[PDB]
Amino acid sequence: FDLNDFLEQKVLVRMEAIINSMTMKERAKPEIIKGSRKRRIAAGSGMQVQDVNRLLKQFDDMQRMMKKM
RNA sequence: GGGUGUGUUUACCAGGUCAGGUCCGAAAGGAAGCAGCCAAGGCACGUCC
């Protein structure tokens, strides 16, 4: 379960714009998304890292449930 | 090394465009700009000087 899927599924159109600023590699291996990328992704989707760093948290809570059942 | 062809590769660090999103503006409208793509470069191979 990568970001690509997590995308399928107001505050929504912004949680998407934040993914639309990533690269295919990222949308697959979110881990590699450390500091510098996090940055690029914020400013690209017009956000604050807190936003990007936020979504990643969501993909995680989400990843977990998924990689559980 | 140069021209050119092909395959492969390349998050951002003043190339072009820029979905999406952001910015400024009461508005009309401006502004920067990620991903993509194009371009460019890297690695090879073919070919020409």
Coordinates of N, CA, C and O in Angstrom, one line a residue, chain A residues 18-65:
Chain A
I18 N -0.9 18.0 -2.2 CA 0.3 17.7 -1.5 C 0.9 16.4 -2.0 O 2.1 16.1 -1.8
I19 N 0.2 15.6 -2.7 CA 0.7 14.4 -3.3 C 1.1 14.7 -4.7 O 2.1 14.1 -5.2
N20 N 0.3 15.5 -5.4 CA 0.6 15.9 -6.8 C 1.9 16.7 -6.9 O 2.2 17.2 -8.0
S21 N 2.7 16.8 -5.8 CA 4.0 17.5 -5.9 C 5.1 16.6 -5.7 O 6.2 17.0 -5.6
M22 N 4.7 15.3 -5.6 CA 5.8 14.3 -5.4 C 6.2 13.6 -6.7 O 5.6 13.9 -7.7
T23 N 7.2 12.8 -6.6 CA 7.6 12.1 -7.8 C 7.1 10.7 -7.6 O 6.7 10.3 -6.6
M24 N 7.2 9.9 -8.7 CA 6.7 8.5 -8.7 C 7.5 7.8 -7.6 O 6.9 6.9 -6.9
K25 N 8.8 8.0 -7.5 CA 9.6 7.3 -6.6 C 9.0 7.5 -5.2 O 8.9 6.6 -4.4
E26 N 8.7 8.8 -4.9 CA 8.2 9.1 -3.6 C 6.8 8.4 -3.3 O 6.7 7.8 -2.3
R27 N 5.9 8.6 -4.2 CA 4.6 8.0 -4.1 C 4.7 6.5 -3.9 O 3.7 5.9 -3.7
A28 N 5.9 6.0 -3.9 CA 6.1 4.5 -3.8 C 6.8 4.2 -2.5 O 6.4 3.4 -1.7
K29 N 8.0 4.9 -2.3 CA 8.8 4.8 -1.1 C 8.8 6.0 -0.2 O 9.8 6.7 -0.1
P30 N 7.6 6.4 0.3 CA 7.5 7.6 1.2 C 8.7 7.8 2.1 O 9.0 8.9 2.5
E31 N 9.3 6.7 2.6 CA 10.4 6.8 3.5 C 11.4 7.8 3.0 O 11.8 8.8 3.7
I32 N 12.0 7.5 1.8 CA 13.0 8.3 1.2 C 12.6 9.8 1.3 O 13.5 10.7 1.0
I33 N 11.4 10.1 1.6 CA 10.9 11.5 1.7 C 11.3 12.1 3.0 O 10.5 12.4 3.9
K34 N 12.6 12.4 3.2 CA 13.1 13.0 4.4 C 13.0 14.6 4.3 O 12.1 15.1 3.6
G35 N 13.9 15.3 5.0 CA 13.8 16.7 5.1 C 13.7 17.5 3.8 O 12.7 18.2 3.6
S36 N 14.7 17.5 2.9 CA 14.7 18.3 1.7 C 13.5 18.0 0.8 O 12.9 19.0 0.3
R37 N 13.2 16.8 0.6 CA 12.0 16.5 -0.3 C 10.8 17.2 0.4 O 10.2 18.0 -0.2
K38 N 10.6 16.8 1.7 CA 9.5 17.3 2.5 C 9.3 18.8 2.1 O 8.3 19.2 1.7
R39 N 10.4 19.5 2.2 CA 10.4 20.9 1.9 C 9.9 21.1 0.5 O 8.8 21.6 0.3
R40 N 10.6 20.7 -0.6 CA 10.1 20.9 -1.9 C 8.6 20.7 -2.1 O 7.9 21.5 -2.8
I41 N 8.1 19.6 -1.5 CA 6.7 19.2 -1.6 C 5.8 20.2 -1.0 O 4.6 20.4 -1.4
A42 N 6.2 20.9 0.1 CA 5.4 21.9 0.7 C 5.3 23.0 -0.3 O 4.2 23.2 -0.8
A43 N 6.3 23.8 -0.5 CA 6.3 24.9 -1.4 C 5.8 24.6 -2.8 O 5.3 25.6 -3.4
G44 N 5.8 23.4 -3.2 CA 5.3 23.1 -4.5 C 3.7 23.1 -4.5 O 3.1 23.5 -5.5
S45 N 3.2 22.6 -3.4 CA 1.7 22.5 -3.3 C 1.3 23.7 -2.4 O 0.1 23.8 -2.0
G46 N 2.2 24.7 -2.3 CA 1.9 25.9 -1.5 C 1.4 25.4 -0.1 O 0.2 25.5 0.2
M47 N 2.3 25.0 0.7 CA 2.0 24.6 2.1 C 3.2 24.8 3.0 O 4.2 25.4 2.7
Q48 N 3.0 24.3 4.2 CA 4.0 24.5 5.2 C 4.4 23.0 5.5 O 3.6 22.1 5.3
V49 N 5.7 22.7 5.9 CA 6.0 21.4 6.0 C 5.0 20.7 7.0 O 4.6 19.6 6.7
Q50 N 4.6 21.4 8.0 CA 3.7 20.9 9.0 C 2.5 20.2 8.2 O 2.0 19.1 8.6
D51 N 2.1 20.7 7.1 CA 1.1 20.2 6.2 C 1.5 18.9 5.6 O 0.9 17.8 5.8
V52 N 2.6 18.9 4.9 CA 3.2 17.8 4.2 C 3.5 16.7 5.3 O 3.1 15.5 5.1
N53 N 4.3 17.1 6.3 CA 4.7 16.2 7.4 C 3.4 15.6 8.0 O 3.4 14.5 8.6
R54 N 2.3 16.4 7.9 CA 1.0 16.0 8.4 C 0.5 14.8 7.6 O 0.2 13.7 8.2
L55 N 0.2 15.0 6.3 CA -0.3 14.0 5.4 C 0.4 12.7 5.6 O -0.2 11.6 5.6
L56 N 1.7 12.7 5.6 CA 2.6 11.6 5.7 C 2.2 10.8 6.9 O 2.2 9.6 7.0
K57 N 1.8 11.5 8.0 CA 1.3 10.9 9.2 C 0.1 10.1 8.9 O -0.1 9.0 9.3
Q58 N -0.8 10.8 8.1 CA -2.1 10.1 7.7 C -1.8 8.9 6.9 O -2.4 7.8 7.2
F59 N -0.9 8.9 5.9 CA -0.6 7.8 5.1 C -0.1 6.7 6.0 O -0.3 5.5 5.8
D60 N 0.5 7.1 7.1 CA 1.0 6.1 8.1 C -0.1 5.4 8.8 O -0.2 4.2 8.8
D61 N -0.9 6.2 9.6 CA -2.0 5.6 10.4 C -2.7 4.7 9.4 O -3.1 3.6 9.8
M62 N -2.9 5.2 8.2 CA -3.5 4.4 7.1 C -2.7 3.2 6.7 O -3.3 2.1 6.5
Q63 N -1.4 3.4 6.5 CA -0.6 2.3 6.1 C -0.8 1.1 7.1 O -1.2 0.0 6.7
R64 N -0.6 1.5 8.4 CA -0.7 0.5 9.5 C -2.0 -0.3 9.5 O -2.0 -1.5 9.4
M65 N -3.2 0.4 9.5 CA -4.4 -0.4 9.4 C -4.4 -1.4 8.3 O -4.6 -2.6 8.5

